[PDB]
Write a protein that binds this ligand. Structure first.
Ligand code: ZN
Ligand code: ZN
Ligand code: ZN
Lengths: 223, 247
């Protein structure tokens, strides 16, 4: 399945929100998972949704007030421990220059570049609320002294330097590249006239999302 | 009480239609000028064959610009409608963006800024041939003048054209009641019942507002292929309004 591709897992392996927000509330997007029993408060974060609850009935809470992640108190959390960052970057390099995995999209139909840009925008919005470790009973509380993740920016910079990845991004929705979550992907069972009409056009919704998030949402950096 | 541009455009198009109808009637009277016009009317002008040919050339040269205008607009809107139908056939009815959804009922139920932004994005994507999985943003109810002009020109063309004018048994060919004017009929032996004549399989599809397509199958056009680039041997597939003016 596309969501199990090693590049996607590498790029979506960020640490938990609770690891840097501590026990205090914060403004962030809130995911609820029906399988793990996370409803009516007791809600997880985006990283937990992508990693801890991959395959569960995890959705986004539209009416989201300020909240923290408590995935630890209800299920086994794989996002509380962060691996070696240098090894992560090295593996990203090797997977970019060794396999054409970057061309394949994920289960949501978004190419790796779009996912990385959206992650960078969301992280820039959220991490500004990170209170540093100010100096001034719960023994099972997870460790909460680690910095917020900073891998998304490096991954975006390095993937943008790759020609194949950028070409697959920009030519996404064209004749060759077609996302599974698009009505024009499977049209081989239609009448030839409808096939011609659908085949004439090319897709630019994903490219428009990528450009909009790169230009108007990623306000933090010009790099 | 309203002071709308569309009303003025429609009224001017109506006047143009009246004038074009009169022109077509006059030119159709040319072949029988002597029997109908010359003898009965005391004061008539002698007409010669070369005069009639020059007259026809003059009329065609004068009507060319409006003809190009209507052809461009109509090819554009037909391409938009055909793409919408194809996407509806290839789309998910549950999504709010599907053509065949209640949200698109246009009577049961965004901001003005959002509407204009949608229109602008649709125009740009259509021009660059990039309108995929997004419904074209168009208002056919605002094309009344184009309708009048097209009606007038088709009237002129039809009137003057009528002025000019066991296998394969007449029993085996589709009749007027089912055939589509200008489209070849589905081959009676290749296609099954469920897709040739859907009404026979499902006789409850008969409704007062029921399309002929879903009652007697989807016809096809013999265009695009078979070479030639006359501009009408190639089907209208491009969705902008410039390329169908270039064509
Ligand atoms: Zn979490
Ligand atoms: Zn779960
Ligand atoms: Zn977790």
């Amino acid at each position: 399945n596309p969501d199990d591709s090693p590049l996607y897992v590498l790029c979506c392996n960020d640490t938990c929100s609770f690891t840097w927000t501590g026990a205090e509330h914060i403004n962030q997007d809130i995911f609820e998972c029906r399988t793990c029993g996370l409803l009516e408060s007791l809600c997880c974060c985006t990283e937990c949704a992508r990693v801890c609850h991959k395959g569960h009935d995890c959705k986004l809470k539209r009416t989201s007030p300020t909240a923290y992640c408590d995935c630890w108190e209800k299920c086994k959390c794989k996002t509380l421990i962060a691996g070696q960052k240098s090894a992560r970057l090295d593996l990203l390099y090797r997977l970019l220059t060794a396999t054409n995995l970057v061309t394949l999209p994920n289960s949501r139909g978004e190419h790796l570049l779009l996912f990385l840009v959206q992650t960078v925008a969301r992280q820039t919005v959220e991490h500004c609320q990170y209170r540093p470790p100010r100096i001034r009973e719960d023994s099972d509380m997870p460790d909460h002294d680690l910095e917020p993740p900073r891998f998304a920016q490096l991954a975006l910079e390095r993937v943008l330097q790759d020609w194949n990845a950028l070409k697959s991004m920009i030519m996404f929705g064209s004749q060759e590249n077609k996302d599974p979550l698009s009505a024009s992907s499977r049209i081989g069972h239609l009448l030839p006239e409808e096939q011609v009409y659908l085949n004439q056009q090319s897709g630019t919704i994903r490219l428009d999302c990528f450009t909009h998030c790169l230009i108007v949402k990623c306000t933090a950096d010009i790099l | 009480n309203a002071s709308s541009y569309l009303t003025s455009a429609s009224s001017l198009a109506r006047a143009y239609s009246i004038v074009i109808r009169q022109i077509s009637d006059l030119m159709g009277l040319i072949p029988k000028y002597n029997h109908l016009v010359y003898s009965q009317i005391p004061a008539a002008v002698k007409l010669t064959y070369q005069d009639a040919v020059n007259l026809q050339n003059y009329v065609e040269e004068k009507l060319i610009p409006t003809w190009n205008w209507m052809v461009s607009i109509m090819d554009s809107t037909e391409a938009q409608l055909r793409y919408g139908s194809a996407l509806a056939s290839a789309g998910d009815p549950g999504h709010p963006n599907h053509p065949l959804h209640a949200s698109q009922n246009s009577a049961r139920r965004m901001s003005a800024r959002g509407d204009f932004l949608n229109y602008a994005l649709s125009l740009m994507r259509s021009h660059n041939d990039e309108h995929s999985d997004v419904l074209p943003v168009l208002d056919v109810c605002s094309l009344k003048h184009v309708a009048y002009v097209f009606q007038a020109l088709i009237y002129w063309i039809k009137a003057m054209n009528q002025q000019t004018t066991g296998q394969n048994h007449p029993f085996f060919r589709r009749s007027d009641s089912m055939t589509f004017l200008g489209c070849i009929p589905p081959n009676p032996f290749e296609v099954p019942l469920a897709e040739a004549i859907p009404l026979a399989d499902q006789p409850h599809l008969l409704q007062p507002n029921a399309r002929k397509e879903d009652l007697f199958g989807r016809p096809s056009q013999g265009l695009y292929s078979s070479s030639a680039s006359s501009g009408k041997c190639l089907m209208e597939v491009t969705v902008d309004r410039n390329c169908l003016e270039v064509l």
